[PDB]
């Protein structure tokens, strides 16, 4: 009996090329993953620091949807955002908050008068 | 008036209402916000020619 050698001296060298290129790419991915981990750790601190100023905008961006929040302590509580329909908008042309935000009124849902906020949100 | 503050110190959470405390909760008693936008790259497979 004998072992059936095939006259294909190229299979072994093709395997080395794939194996060699696989080893280096996997090492680069590991190095990149470590760097991203450190960056995300720092970004967590910068997000907590900014939450102490304007909690509503920071929380909305994190969620991806319009929400409401209020920091009454070291734990931030998130409330639910009730929307309104475009039925009534008032834009007074005089400002006399020190008359900074315009005095506006709306109706439907409920109706009231107030000062226009930011990002199409009304008080 | 009503004053819900609930600080945190060490491995303990002290809850205060109306300038008074009545409860103590562990850290796991409250869910933790997460912000970890992360890659989902996968290592390349192994092939036997």
């Amino acid at each position: 009996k004998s072992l059936g050698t095939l006259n294909n001296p190229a299979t072994v060298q093709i395997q080395f090329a794939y194996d060699s290129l696989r080893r280096q790419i996997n090492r680069m991915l590991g190095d990149l993953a470590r760097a991203w981990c450190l960056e995300q750790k720092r970004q967590n601190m910068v997000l907590r620091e900014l939450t102490k100023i304007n909690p509503t905008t920071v929380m909305s961006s994190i969620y991806g949807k319009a929400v409401a929040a209020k920091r009454l302590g070291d734990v931030i509580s998130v409330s639910q955002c009730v929307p309104v329909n475009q039925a009534t908008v008032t834009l007074r042309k005089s400002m006399r908050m020190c008359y900074s935000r315009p005095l506006v009124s709306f109706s439907f849902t409920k109706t009231y008068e107030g000062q226009l906020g930011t990002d199409n949100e009304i008080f | 008036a009503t004053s819900q503050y609930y600080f945190q110190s060490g491995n303990e959470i002290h809850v205060y209402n109306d300038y008074h405390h009545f409860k103590t909760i562990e850290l796991d008693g409250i869910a933790t916000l997460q912000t970890f936008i992360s890659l989902n790259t996968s290592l390349i497979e192994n092939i036997d020619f």
Partner: peptide, 30 residues
């Protein structure tokens, strides 16, 4: 995208706490 809303609510609701130490995921093997 962003609809008009007059919520302005700061009552009791869901609570959330910021993490203090992020655990780094790992994928090493073999």
């Amino acid at each position: 995208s962003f609809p008009f809303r007059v919520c302005e609510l700061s009552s009791h609701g869901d609570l959330f706490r910021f993490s203090s130490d992020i655990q780094c995921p790992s994928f090493g093997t073999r």
